[PDB]
Write an enzyme that holds these catalytic residues in place. Structure first.
Site, PDB file in Angstrom:
ATOM      1  N   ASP A 105      17.269  -9.344  19.871  1.00 27.88           N
ATOM      2  CA  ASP A 105      18.604  -9.866  20.029  1.00 27.88           C
ATOM      3  C   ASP A 105      18.724 -11.294  19.488  1.00 27.88           C
ATOM      4  OD1 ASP A 105      21.127 -10.662  20.769  1.00 27.88           O
ATOM      5  OD2 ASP A 105      20.995  -9.911  22.814  1.00 27.88           O
ATOM      6  N   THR A 106      19.117 -11.406  18.204  1.00 28.66           N
ATOM      7  CA  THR A 106      19.381 -12.709  17.546  1.00 28.66           C
ATOM      8  C   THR A 106      20.532 -13.496  18.211  1.00 28.66           C
ATOM      9  OG1 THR A 106      20.976 -11.791  15.932  1.00 28.66           O
ATOM     10  CG2 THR A 106      18.617 -11.845  15.260  1.00 28.66           C
ATOM     11  N   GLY A 107      21.373 -12.804  18.979  1.00 29.72           N
ATOM     12  CA  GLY A 107      22.478 -13.440  19.710  1.00 29.72           C
ATOM     13  C   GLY A 107      22.128 -14.134  21.041  1.00 29.72           C
TER      14      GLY A 107
END
Length: 198
Positions: A124-126
């Protein structure tokens, strides 16, 4: 463009004849944008996230231009704290997650080993942080509140925790709490050498 994940993966978007900044978010099934003016018909819809649920206005067939790349698809508008470019659009700008090279047509799930226990978790880059479902973890911790799509959750903060993620060891801060998914955030994604590519 190759992005490292030391900083938030922000891009410029043009949507509805307006300019915005949004987070490339491998963790999200959908694209969600803070309240804004769009032309056309929509349908009411709810989505969940960390913290609970938000009523959004769903528009389909919306043209969006992300870092010079055109795409048409579904854009959700509502009370999201951040503008989030979801996998529905990441797959359209050819975006990949390298650390293996993972395309984003499915949720980028991996196996972790933490506290002598095997779990699945989402790349999850977010997420600035790593946050996991309730589990038995050794040691001492501190109370913390973190924010997400649906408000806030209370989490337990454990530091200097070893995680093996798909064969790569890493050490740092894991949060435990009422998260709907196991989430591997940028604190650990930088350690296994994750990049984003489009």
């Amino acid at each position: 463009p190759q992005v490292t994940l030391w900083q938030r993966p922000l891009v410029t978007i043009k949507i509805g004849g307006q300019l915005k900044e949004a987070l490339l978010d491998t963790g999200a099934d959908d694209t969600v944008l803070e309240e804004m003016s769009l032309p056309g018909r929509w349908k009411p819809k709810m989505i969940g996230g960390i913290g609970g649920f938000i009523k959004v206005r769903q528009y389909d067939q919306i043209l969006i231009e992300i870092c010079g790349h055109k795409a048409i698809g579904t854009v959700l508008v509502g009370p999201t704290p951040s503008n989030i470019i979801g996998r529905n659009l990441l797959t359209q700008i050819g975006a990949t997650l390298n650390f293996p090279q993972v395309t984003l047509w499915q949720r980028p799930l991996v196996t972790i080993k933490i506290g002598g226990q095997l779990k699945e978790a989402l790349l999850d880059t977010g997420a600035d942080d790593t946050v996991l479902e309730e589990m038995s973890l050794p040691g001492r911790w501190k109370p913390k509140m973190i924010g997400g799509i649906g408000g806030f959750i209370k989490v337990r903060q454990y530091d200097q925790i070893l995680i093996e993620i798909c064969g790569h060891k890493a050490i740092g801060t894991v949060l435990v709490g009422p998260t709907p998914s196991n989430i591997i955030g940028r604190n650990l994604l930088t350690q296994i050498g994750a990049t984003l590519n489009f």
